[PDB]
Each structure stands twice: as C-alpha cells, then as structure tokens.
Design a protein around this ligand. Structure first.
Ligand SMILES: *[C@@H]1O[C@H](CO)[C@@H](O[C@@H]2O[C@H](CO)[C@@H](O)[C@H](O)[C@H]2NC(C)=O)[C@H](O)[C@H]1NC(C)=O
Ligand SMILES: *[C@@H]1O[C@H](CO)[C@@H](O)[C@H](O)[C@H]1NC(C)=O
Ligand SMILES: *[C@@H]1O[C@H](CO)[C@@H](O)[C@H](O)[C@H]1NC(C)=O
Ligand SMILES: *[C@@H]1O[C@H](CO)[C@@H](O)[C@H](O)[C@H]1NC(C)=O
Ligand SMILES: *[C@@H]1O[C@H](CO)[C@@H](O)[C@H](O)[C@H]1NC(C)=O
Ligand SMILES: *[C@@H]1O[C@H](CO)[C@@H](O)[C@H](O)[C@H]1NC(C)=O
Ligand SMILES: *[C@@H]1O[C@H](CO)[C@@H](O)[C@H](O)[C@H]1NC(C)=O
Ligand SMILES: *[C@@H]1O[C@H](CO)[C@@H](O)[C@H](O)[C@H]1NC(C)=O
Lengths: 254, 163, 99, 49
C-alpha cells in the first residue's frame, strides 16, 4: 500500500552548524587520561549540516545519497522518527536494508523491498498505519532487537558501511533547547555492528503521521556526511571522551 | 504408510544441511571453547581474538560497558575484560631482567654473585636491592669504600663476596 | 662471563651476561557464554514434517550451532557429510545454513 | 620555566624511548606488525621474508 501526500508546503531545506557534534568512539579500546590520534571517517567540526523539519505543513522525507557515512541528528519529542531505509536503487532489482521501531519492537531486515515513493508510519488518536513497502521477495537477514529510542530528546546516530560491516553508533541526550542543535560535546557509543555485506549508496528516513487528513508531529532532524580525517581525542580518568580536536579545521587545532 | 511395512518401505525423515558461505560476514559458528581463568601466572591468553602472553592480575580500572580492551600510550594491550565474568584484568609482561655477574679476578677467586636487575627475590645469601635481587653476596651492616658498583648506593667487594 | 668476554680470565667488576625471562606455563582461552544456540530442535524434533515435493526449507542463520549434538546422537540412521569432515563442523564458520 | 634545562633533557629521553616503542607498531612494509600473526598465518618460506 502506498499513498501520495499532496498537502505539503514547498520550502527549501535549511543549513546550520555542526559545532563539536558527530564524534564517536573509533574502537572498543578503553583509554584513560591520554590523547589519541585517529584517522577515521569523521564529521568535521563546525560543518554545514542539512536541516529538515516536521511541523504543522512541513513533512520532510527526501531521499539522500549515503556517501561514505552518515551522521543523523534528531531533536525529537513524542517519537515521530521510527527508522531508516538503505540501499542503492530502493527497488526489487537490488537488495535493501530496512530499520524500523514501531510501537512494540525493533526490526532489522535485509530484503528486496518494492518501496513506496512516499513511505511512512501512522498513529491514530494507537499506531495503525504501516506504508513502507509493497513486497518483500528475497530476505537474506532478519534481526530483532531491543528498543533503540519543546524538544526533549537529542538522538545522535552514525551509520558506516565498511567491508560489509554496518556500524551504528548511537547516543541519547536529555535536552531542553527549543529550535536548533545544542552546543556541547557528547561522544557516541557504538550500538550495533551489523553483518549485511551489501552496497549502500542512498538512504531515506521514516516519519510517522498523526490521524484525528494527516498531521505531522513536531520533530526536526539533521543530515551530515563523514569524510576521512584525523581527530585528536582526549580520554579522562574515567575513560570517557570529553574533548576532541579537528586537525584540519584551523591552524591552531592543527 | 502402514506400521507393518518392511525396512525400505517405512517412512524416513530427512534433513539436508547445506552450509553456504557468501562473502557477507559469517555468523554461523561452532561453540567457542573456554577454560578456567588462571591468574598470577605467565600464561598465553586468547580473549575474543586478542592473543598474547602475560600475567593476568586484578585491575582497579573501571571500564565502560561497551569497551573490552585497554591500551597505554604505546598502543600495547595492558588491560582487558574477561568475557565470562565482567572483570578487568591488567596484563603485565612475564618478568624480564638483566643477569649480571659480579666477580673478583679469576687470579683472586672463582666465587661469583648474580644480580637479577629489576627482579623481585620471591619469583626468581639472597638480598633485595633497589637495583634488583642479588644472590650469593652476604649483606653486611658495615660501610666501606665502593669496590664493585652495584647501584642505588649498593657496592660489592671480596674479603667471600659481601654487599 | 668467560664466554661473553671471550677470555679465560675475568677482571674484577660487574659484567652483564644474559637475560632472565619467565616462561609461559598455560594457555587460557576464555570466551563468552555459549548463548543463542540455533533452533535445531524445531527442525529435527518437529511434530509435522513436509512431503518431498513440497519440502520445507529453514534458513539457519545468525546463531551458533552445536553440530556434535547431532553427530553424537544415537537416533540418526544415516549421517553422510560430503564436502566437509563431520568432526570439523564445530570449527568451520559458514555464512548461513539451509535445512 | 626556571628548571627548563633539566626538563628538556628528561623530555628528550622520554620522547626517544616513546618513539622507540612506537616503532614496534609499524610493519615496515610487511603484512603485519605482529610476529605471532605471521607465524600463525603463513608457512615458514614466506614467514622468513
Ligand atoms: C506517488 O507518486 C509517485 C511519483 O509520481 C508515483 O510514482 C510513479 O507512479 C507512476 C504511476 O504509473 C509510474 O508510471 C512512475 O514510474 C512512478 N515513478 C517512479 C519514479 O517509479 C507513485 O506511484 C505514487 N503512488 C501512488 C500510490 O500512486
Ligand atoms: C551551507 O550551504 C548552503 C547551500 O548549500 C549555503 O547557502 C550556506 O551559506 C552554507 N553555510 C555555511 C555556514 O557555509
Ligand atoms: C511491529 O513490527 C513487527 C514486525 O513486522 C510485528 O511483528 C509487530 O506486530 C509490529 N507491531 C505492531 C504494534 O504492529
Ligand atoms: C529473487 O526473487 C525473484 C522473484 O521473487 C526470484 O525469481 C529470484 O530467483 C530470487 N533470487 C534469489 C537469489 O533468491
Ligand atoms: C555500488 O553502487 C554504486 C551506484 O549504484 C556503484 O557505482 C558502485 O560500483 C557499486 N559498488 C559495488 C561494489 O557494487
Ligand atoms: C570520574 O568518576 C568519579 C567517580 O567514579 C567522579 O567522582 C569524577 O567526578 C569523574 N570525573 C569525570 C571527569 O567525569
Ligand atoms: C555467564 O555465566 C555466568 C554463570 O553461568 C554468569 O555469572 C555471567 O553473568 C554470564 N555472562 C553473560 C554475559 O551472560
Ligand atoms: C530431540 O529430543 C531428544 C530428547 O529430548 C534429544 O535427545 C535430541 O537431541 C533432540 N533433537 C534435536 C535437538 O535435534
């Protein structure tokens, strides 16, 4: 089942500053009170991060190129964002990865979905509307896991697809800021190391409708892209990353 | 199918297991064998694919729950988490020290003493110095001029060999 | 010391000759608790099997399989492994199994 | 910075020792910087190289 949503308001996507966000733990190694230099796929400091809104009539679900890695930021309340879609052509010609969190449980599937042009979730005021794909023919991997999930929550995710291994780094932050990204430091802990082994070049996030036509709940998300660079990471006496230096930002940090 | 049938006409349940290996990451393996953890001994450890040789002792370093190994400045694994019981163990290298021989002239005597540098005396006329463990030299309370230098204010001489 | 200095006479002094290394005494191979075994009980001990024209296929994946509870089971009349040695199944790792 | 002359000597000695231990992590063009990985992964005719 697919439904075109035709009551959108045309508006260009916004842009804002990354500040010192997008940092994650590069490995599973404890380090204490030391400075460690790493050359990994990182998000640059103070970079141009793309801003999309869901407000009521704005309903931002475009389909974006994956590049070498994706930082996803979510200034979220009442859980509108439910999952993501990864693939190359997003049809049954290729094989695609689906990540959802509905009202009960977290589902990870690798199938050849015939995706809708406008896929979404829907909550009736209870969640009773599922329009993501019309078919699923050759499913090669299934994984059922724990629940991952004024704006009250900051949900930061980093997706990488290296050597057939799809790394999900995640962080949940209690925030109380109204509109933009908070300015601060928060290292992303590794959440899921996922054995898919497929080509991913394009992704699309999943929103949820509210029915009482449809209504979009208040949410905002941010898309940034990872590039290979070096950070100098600081590890405290408790082994928690508190600060980092982008070596290619300015000559002082160099 | 009747139960009164002979063998060869009776039903047979068949399961055919086909192990296929595509170049996606492999997730079907056998049972990983484990053995009892032995501490305070120089053993060859293999923890989750990280192998080495060391003495595994108890650690006061409190790891975060997603972290498994620990590295120093020189990127050598000196801390690790046991996967069976979530405890932290500080790997320490199986002890090494210089073996120095303190002797007078062979025209004088053939008696020698052995210095194990930076080595405790409990794991090797036995005397513990800051330079190391000295075996074969009688420690005296009297002070003389330094004849053969040992280090850290300790000197050896021949009169037997005294330190 | 005589062998180190290449002389049969050694002068008075301290001479570093060799190195004392403690040697390995055991092998310790601690691994995680053997959890999430593959559901072979729902395949082999199933109540209702299929017919051979419509044979059932279960894709055993994302789990760990103890093959030597099958090879040491007295019930099986025929156990023929063709491409692989039977006892080597607990060591080889495969991407997935089809039952 | 009154005692900087001693501190430079101490820092240079510690930095030289640190760089000497950092040189063990380089493979120098080989397949790995660990000897045990080479002894476990290869036959002796290539392992000697
Ligand atoms: C929602 O809109 C999209 C965009 O127009 C529709 O996708 C097209 O549907 C037509 C219908 O025959 C096809 O000819 C096009 O090839 C489709 N475009 C692409 C890129 O595949 C979609 O069908 C609409 N949804 C529904 C339920 O009608
Ligand atoms: C971000 O990009 C947009 C266009 O893509 C540009 O107009 C804007 O100035 C950029 N912001 C910064 C801080 O460079
Ligand atoms: C959520 O999705 C899973 C998998 O499709 C399904 O089993 C479950 O019933 C769904 N929950 C609801 C409330 O529909
Ligand atoms: C994929 O699905 C199509 C149709 O569902 C089928 O014809 C094809 O054989 C399948 N391929 C694989 C590898 O399963
Ligand atoms: C992955 O997909 C992109 C675009 O579809 C293509 O250019 C690239 O060659 C593909 N890579 C592999 C390994 O298939
Ligand atoms: C480290 O943890 C201790 C308690 O374990 C706490 O008192 C201290 O404030 C922490 N330091 C930092 C920098 O988080
Ligand atoms: C492994 O088992 C022991 C005892 O059976 C238990 O104490 C320990 O918590 C278990 N570890 C995990 C990760 O389940
Ligand atoms: C079936 O059940 C019996 C007895 O409970 C057991 O011995 C056998 O291993 C089972 N078969 C499986 C698990 O394949």
């Amino acid at each position: 089942q697919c439904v075109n949503l035709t009551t959108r308001t045309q508006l260009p996507p916004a842009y804002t500053n990354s500040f010192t966000r997008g940092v994650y733990y590069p490995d599973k190694v404890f380090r204490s009170s030391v400075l460690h230099s790493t050359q990994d796929l990182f998000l640059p400091f103070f970079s141009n991060v793309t801003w999309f809104h869901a407000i009521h009539k704005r309903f931002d679900n475009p389909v974006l190129p994956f590049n070498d890695g994706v930082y996803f930021a979510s200034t979220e309340k009442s859980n509108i964002i439910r999952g993501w879609i990864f693939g190359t052509t997003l049809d049954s010609k290729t094989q695609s990865l689906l990540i959802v969190n509905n009202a009960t449980n977290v589902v990870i599937k690798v199938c050849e979905f015939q995706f809708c042009n406008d896929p979404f979730l829907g909550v009736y005021y209870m969640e009773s509307e599922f329009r993501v794909y019309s078919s699923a023919n050759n499913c090669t991997f299934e994984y059922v896991s724990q629940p991952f999930l004024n704006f009250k929550n900051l949900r930061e995710f980093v997706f990488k697809n290296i050597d057939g291994y799809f790394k999900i780094y995640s962080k949940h932050t209690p925030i109380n800021l109204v509109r933009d990204l908070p300015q601060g430091f928060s290292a992303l802990e590794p959440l899921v190391d996922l054995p898919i082994g497929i080509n991913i070049t394009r992704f699309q996030t999943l929103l949820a409708l509210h029915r009482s036509g449809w209504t979009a709940g208040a949410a905002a998300y941010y898309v940034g892209y990872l590039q290979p660079r070096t950070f100098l990471l600081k590890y405290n006496e408790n082994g928690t990353i508190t600060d980092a230096v982008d070596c290619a930002l300015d000559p002082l940090s160099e | 199918f009747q139960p009164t049938y002979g063998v060869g006409y009776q039903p047979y349940r068949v399961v055919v297991l086909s192990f296929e290996l595509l170049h996606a990451p492999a997730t079907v393996c056998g049972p990983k064998k484990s053995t009892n953890l032995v501490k305070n001994k120089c053993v060859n450890f293999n923890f989750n694919g990280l192998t080495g040789t060391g003495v595994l002792t108890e650690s006061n370093k409190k790891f975060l729950p997603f972290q498994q190994f620990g590295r120093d400045i020189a990127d050598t694994t000196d801390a690790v988490r046991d996967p069976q019981t979530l405890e932290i163990l500080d790997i320490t290298p199986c002890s090494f020290g210089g073996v120095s021989v303190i002797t007078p002239g062979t025209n004088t005597s053939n008696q020698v003493a052995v210095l194990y540098q930076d080595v405790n005396c409990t794991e090797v006329n036995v005397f513990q110095t800051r330079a190391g463990c000295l075996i074969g030299a009688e420690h005296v309370n009297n002070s003389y001029e330094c004849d053969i230098p040992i280090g850290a204010g300790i000197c050896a001489s021949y009169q037997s060999i005294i330190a | 010391t005589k062998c180190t200095l290449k002389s049969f006479t050694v002068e008075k002094g301290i001479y570093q000759t060799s190195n004392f290394r403690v040697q390995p005494t055991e092998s310790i191979v601690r691994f995680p608790n053997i959890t999430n075994l593959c559901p072979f009980g729902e395949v082999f001990n199933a109540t209702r099997f299929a017919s051979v024209y419509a044979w059932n296929r279960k894709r055993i994946s994302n789990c760990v399989a103890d093959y030597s509870v099958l090879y040491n089971s007295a019930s099986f009349s025929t156990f023929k492994c063709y491409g692989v040695s039977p006892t080597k199944l607990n060591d080889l790792c495969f991407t997935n199994v089809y039952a | 910075s009154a005692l900087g002359k001693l501190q430079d000597v101490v820092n240079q000695n510690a930095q030289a020792l640190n760089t000497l231990v950092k040189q063990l992590s380089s493979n120098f063009g080989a397949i790995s910087s660990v000897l045990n990985d080479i002894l476990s992964r290869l036959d002796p005719p290539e392992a000697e190289v």
